Amino acid sequence: AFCNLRRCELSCRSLGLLGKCIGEECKCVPH
């Protein structure tokens, strides 16, 4: 698992979300 940020964001577009780092792992946000 990584904070791939650039790739994290593109993964999060699956639900239309922004992608962010939260300590070594990517997690999306409802904003």
Protein described:
By secondary structure, this protein is α+β, with helices and mostly antiparallel strands. The protein has one domain. 23% of the residues lie in helices and 26% in strands. It contains one helix and two strands, in the order αββ. Strands 1-2 form a two-stranded antiparallel sheet. The longest helix is centred in the N-terminal third of the chain and has 7 residues, at 6-12. The N and C termini lie far apart (23 Å). 3% of the residues are buried. It is classed as toxin. The entry lists the keywords Y31H, CSalpha/beta, SK channels, toxin. It forms a monomeric assembly.
Describe the SSE topology.
Layout: H1 6-12, E1 18-21, E2 26-29
Antiparallel strand pairs: 1-2
Short characterization:
The longest helix has 7 residues, at 6-12. The protein has one helix spanning 6-12, and strands at 18-21, 26-29.
Describe this protein with a few key phrases.
toxin activity, alpha+beta, two-stranded antiparallel sheet, 31 residues, 1 helix, 2 strands
Which structural category fits the helices and strands? alpha+beta
Q: What is the end-to-end distance?
A: 23 Å
What does the largest sheet look like? 2 strands, antiparallel
Radius of gyration: 8 Å
Number of DSSP helical runs: 1
The 3D shape can be described as: globular
Question: What number of domains?
Answer: 1
Helix amount, in percent? 10-25%
SSE pattern, N- to C-terminal: HEE
Give me the count of strands: 2
What percent of residues are in strands?
A: 25-35%
What order do the strands of the largest sheet run in, or round the barrel if closed?
1-2
